[PDB]
């Protein structure tokens, strides 16, 4: 048969890279995240220009792990003045709401043939934190993540 679900012109998709496995667990538990100052600025702009016309998806991967670990949607703008030190390292300023919609490990081998024309045609699996994913490649990534078993 066929699965044409992801094949939608409104939506923006970003890679999230975490050094910390603990912080992934905490994000899933409490449905919150924080990036760097410049990453927060990037995500906040995308969320606030989307005006709720479509989702901002976050594709999570722990640095060095060899796999993605799940997918969340942004659910709020960035609040830059929040309690410090709630994450494994005290390196972060602020907080935004997410909603994890998918938690499972997807090996990089399933995804490394998808390349990002906006990042020198490097594999999507070689991205840095808050690398944006072109929509047509994001649809391919989401289908692979959803279909993996
Ligand atoms: O390793 C990390 C850990 C976090 C915590 C959520 C703040 N954020 C990030 O971008 N990388
Ligand atoms: Cl695009």
UniProtKB/Swiss-Prot annotation:
Its post-translational modification remark reads:
Ubiquitinated by the SCF(SKP2) complex, leading to its degradation.
Q: Which tissues does the record link to its expression?
A: Highly expressed in induced pluripotent stem cells (iPSCs) and down-regulated during neural differentiation.
Domain spans labelled YTH: 11-145
Name where it's found. Answer: Cytoplasm, Cytosol; Cytoplasm, P-body; Cytoplasm, Stress granule; Nucleus
On the tree of life, the source organism's domain of life is: Eukaryota
Annotated region (Interaction with m6A-containing mRNAs), positions in chain:
9-149
Q: Which residues hold RNA?
A: 17-19, 23, 33-34, 63, 87, 92
Q: What is known of its domains?
A: The disordered regions have the ability to interact with each other and to 'phase separate' into liquid droplets within the cytosol following binding to mRNAs containing multiple m6A-modified residues. This leads to the partition of m6A-containing mRNAs into membraneless compartments, where mRNAs may be stored, degraded or used to transport mRNAs to dendritic arbors in neurons.
- Give the UniProt family note: Belongs to the YTHDF family. YTHDF2 subfamily.
Please describe the quaternary structure of this protein: Interacts with CNOT1; interaction is direct and promotes recruitment of the CCR4-NOT complex. Interacts with YTHDF3. Interacts with RIDA/HRSP12; interaction leads to recruitment of the ribonuclease P/MRP complex.
Protein's UniProt name: YTH domain-containing family protein 2
Organism, by scientific name, is Homo sapiens
Q: Which gene encodes it?
A: YTHDF2
Boundaries of the shown chain within the full protein? 408 to 548 of 579
């Amino acid at each position: 048969g066929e699965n044409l679900y992801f094949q939608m012109k409104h939506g923006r998709v970003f890679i999230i890279k975490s050094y910390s496995e603990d912080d992934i667990h905490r994000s899933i538990k409490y449905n919150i995240w924080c990036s760097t100052e410049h990453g927060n600025k990037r995500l906040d702009a995308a969320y606030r220009s989307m005006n709720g016309k479509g989702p901002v998806y976050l594709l999570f991967s722990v640095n060095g792990s060899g796999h993605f670990c799940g997918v969340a949607e942004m659910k709020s703008a960035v609040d830059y003045n929040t309690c410090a030190g709630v994450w494994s390292q005290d390196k972060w300023k602020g907080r935004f709401d997410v909603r994890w919609i998918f938690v499972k490990d997807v090996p990089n081998s399933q995804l490394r043939h998808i390349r990002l024309e906006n990042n020198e045609n490097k594999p999507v699996t070689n991205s840095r934190d808050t690398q944006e994913v072109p929509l047509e490649k994001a649809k391919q990534v989401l289908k692979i993540i959803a279909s993996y078993k």
